[PDB]
Amino acid sequence: REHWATRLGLILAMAGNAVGLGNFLRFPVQAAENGGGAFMIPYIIAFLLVGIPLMWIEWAMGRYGGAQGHGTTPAIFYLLWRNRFAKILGVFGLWIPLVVAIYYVYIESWTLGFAIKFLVGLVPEPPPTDPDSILRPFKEFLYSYIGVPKGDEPILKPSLFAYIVFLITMFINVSILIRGISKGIERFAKIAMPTLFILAVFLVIRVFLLETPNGTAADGLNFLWTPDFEKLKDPGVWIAAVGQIFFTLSLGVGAIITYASYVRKDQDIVLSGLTAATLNEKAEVILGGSISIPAAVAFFGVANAVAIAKAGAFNLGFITLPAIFSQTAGGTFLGFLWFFLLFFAGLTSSIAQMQPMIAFLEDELKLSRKHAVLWTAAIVFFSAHLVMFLNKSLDEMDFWAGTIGVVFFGLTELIIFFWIFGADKAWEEINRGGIIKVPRIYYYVMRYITPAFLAVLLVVWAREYIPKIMEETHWTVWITRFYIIGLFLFLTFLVFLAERRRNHESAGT
Numbered sequence: 039r040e041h042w043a044t045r046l047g048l049i050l051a052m053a054g055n056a057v058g059l060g061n062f063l064r065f066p067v068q069a070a071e072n073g074g075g076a077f078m079i080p081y082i083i084a085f086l087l088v089g090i091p092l093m094w095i096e097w098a099m100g101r102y103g104g105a106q107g108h109g110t111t112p113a114i115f116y117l118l119w120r121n122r123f124a125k126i127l128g129v130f131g132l133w134i135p136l137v138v139a140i141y142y143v144y145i146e147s148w149t150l151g152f153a154i155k156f157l158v159g160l161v162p163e164p165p166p167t168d169p170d171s172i173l174r175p176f177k178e179f180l181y182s183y184i185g186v187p188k189g190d191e192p193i194l195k196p197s198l199f200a201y202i203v204f205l206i207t208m209f210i211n212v213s214i215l216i217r218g219i220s221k222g223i224e225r226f227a228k229i230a231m232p233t234l235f236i237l238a239v240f241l242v243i244r245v246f247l248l249e250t251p252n253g254t255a256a257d258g259l260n261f262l263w264t265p266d267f268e269k270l271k272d273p274g275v276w277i278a279a280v281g282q283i284f285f286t287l288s289l290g291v292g293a294i295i296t297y298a299s300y301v302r303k304d305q306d307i308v309l310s311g312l313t314a315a316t317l318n319e320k321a322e323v324i325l326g327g328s329i330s331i332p333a334a335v336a337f338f339g340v341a342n343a344v345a346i347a348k349a350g351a352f353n354l355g356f357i358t359l360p361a362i363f364s365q366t367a368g369g370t371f372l373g374f375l376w377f378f379l380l381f382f383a384g385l386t387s388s389i390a391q392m393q394p395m396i397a398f399l400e401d402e403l404k405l406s407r408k409h410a411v412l413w414t415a416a417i418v419f420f421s422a423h424l425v426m427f428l429n430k431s432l433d434e435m436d437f438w439a440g441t442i443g444v445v446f447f448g449l450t451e452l453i454i455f456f457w458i459f460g461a462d463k464a465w466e467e468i469n470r471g472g473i474i475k476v477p478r479i480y481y482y483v484m485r486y487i488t489p490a491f492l493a494v495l496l497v498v499w500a501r502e503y504i505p506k507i508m509e510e511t512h513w514t515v516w517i518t519r520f521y522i523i524g525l526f527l528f529l530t531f532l533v534f535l536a537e538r539r540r541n542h543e544s545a546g547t
């Protein structure tokens with residue numbers, strides 16, 4: 039069974055896992071829609087009571103399960119909890135990361151398509167100066183790439199270039215994954231993370247130099263880092279902060295677990311985990327938070343920046359930022375550094391999203407890595423056509439897989455590992471072989487605070503958001519729900535087959 043060759047490589051893979059589009063696209067938007075500093079306070083609390091505790095749990099389970107020749111939650115849950123239901127609950131450990139990949143890798147291919155276009159300088163050019171007049175050419179640039187429907191029909195019509203770029207993006211993903219953990223994920227991680235960090239730092243440094251009558255990037259930084267206690271009372275920001283912490287650290291997806299299942303039985307996870315997490319957070323709060331927002335505040339001011347943030351998840355990064363850059367010296371090339379950055383950020387994450395599926399086919403169905411990778415790619419590529427052609431389908435998958443799903447699963451694995459499997463055995467399995475030990479206080483957070491914190495949160499989310507689901511929405515949302523539900527059924531079947539092959543290979547040996 040493959041292992042991480044070096045400690046550094048492991049850290050970088052785990053950090054490349056968490057450091058993605060969420061750091062440079064999602065965080066700024068989330069931080070802005072919530073008043074900046076108002077969002078930061080709950081964000082810090084979430085990182086301590088949730089982000090970190092659960093972080094160690096997933097490493098513990100990954101390494102615990104990895105020892106016994108398993109890298110996925112269906113099998114691992116069964117080990118921590120010998121029950122047929124524990125295997126069915128573990129199916130999400132394959133479903134969630136697989137669903138996320140379906141739309142994530144597509145957004146990833148965008149950054150690749152923009153990077154290329156920007157490199158060759160095949161971009162729009164606004165005349166020298168109205169915000170709408172300069173932004174419009176960029177909106178039209180994105181809407182033409184992904185093929186936003188002009189007509190009432192909710193149908194997307196992506197360009198030939200966009201479609202092929204997706205093929206390439208998938209191909210690049212496969213080329214890395216087909217090499218395995220050390221030769222592939224780890225090898226690429228070492229080169230990708232440093233590069234990423236360099237690009238980010240350069241962009242942050244370059245962004246600061248932005249200066250206009252409307253303001254400066256210095257103002258924007260004061261907006262996000264200004265603590266406001268008035269908004270603290272609202273649950274909206276708490277749910278936003280905790281949802282972001284989950285997405286950024288990649289928790290409740292089962293991806294961290296698969297990666298960690300390649301860590302050696304006694305090898306440290308306490309420090310290793312802590313570090314990789316800290317790397318993501320440092321990159322998110324410092325690097326990701328200093329580019330998008332400060333640039334918009336500079337060129338547009340705060341109020342209008344928040345307006346742009348609330349406008350869309352891609353508006354800031356795919357339209358505004360490139361437009362803001364097109365006004366600066368060497369903006370187009372700077373746009374290429376931006377999208378190239380994103381592409382490496384997403385690529386290190388998309389490979390981690392497909393690894394659980396790859397690990398399952400290998401560990402449980404005894405498929406060669408070559409076959410495990412090609413079929414997984416085939417499933418992701420095929421499934422992605424829904425996201426590419428069916429308007430709003432992307433939104434749907436992100437809500438269930440990357441939003442509601444990851445929290446439900448976070449509480450599940452936490453309960454199984456600590457409550458069912460035993461709180462003390464979990465503690466040993468976590469601290470065992472740890473270069474350092476987990477603070478005794480976190481023992482109580484894990485067993486009591488985190489699950490209660492999550493439980494209450496989920497209920498609150500259910501009380502206000504549940505009415506919305508199926509109450510009123512376009513019927514096309516069912517096309518996505520129908521498919522992703524079928525995805526779960528298909529994954530349940532494989533689990534069923536994996537348990538049956540296990541039975542024959544027991545009597546025959």
Ligand SMILES: CCCCCCCCO[C@@H]1O[C@H](CO)[C@@H](O)[C@H](O)[C@H]1O
Pocket residue numbers: 195196197198199201
């Ligand atoms: C490569 C796999 C076979 C093609 C999958 C069938 C659907 C893709 O269809 C393709 O969509 C593109 C974007 O709309 C168009 O530009 C292409 O002309 C069209 O062939």
Ligand SMILES: CCCCCCCCO[C@@H]1O[C@H](CO)[C@@H](O)[C@H](O)[C@H]1O
Pocket residue numbers: 154197198199202
């Ligand atoms: C890394 C670059 C990938 C190859 C780029 C191929 C996509 C561009 O293809 C172009 O698409 C246009 C719109 O459909 C057509 O008008 C052109 O005839 C066609 O060459």
Ligand SMILES: CCCCCCCCO[C@@H]1O[C@H](CO)[C@@H](O)[C@H](O)[C@H]1O
Pocket residue numbers: 423424427428
């Ligand atoms: C919804 C998931 C499946 C989407 C696949 C759509 C395949 C595209 O379908 C074809 O696209 C052509 C453009 O290249 C159009 O000219 C044709 O009219 C259309 O049949």
Ligand SMILES: N[C@@H](Cc1c[nH]c2ccccc12)C(=O)O
Pocket residue numbers: 055056057058059060061135138285286287288289291293294387388390391440
């Ligand atoms: N964590 C990545 C994106 C992501 C979300 N869930 C994941 C699950 C597995 C791998 C990556 C992810 C980011 O910060 O942008």
Ligand code: NA
Pocket residue numbers: 053054055056057058059382383384385386387388
């Ligand atoms: Na990444």
Ligand code: NA
Pocket residue numbers: 056057058060061285286287318322
């Ligand atoms: Na992240």
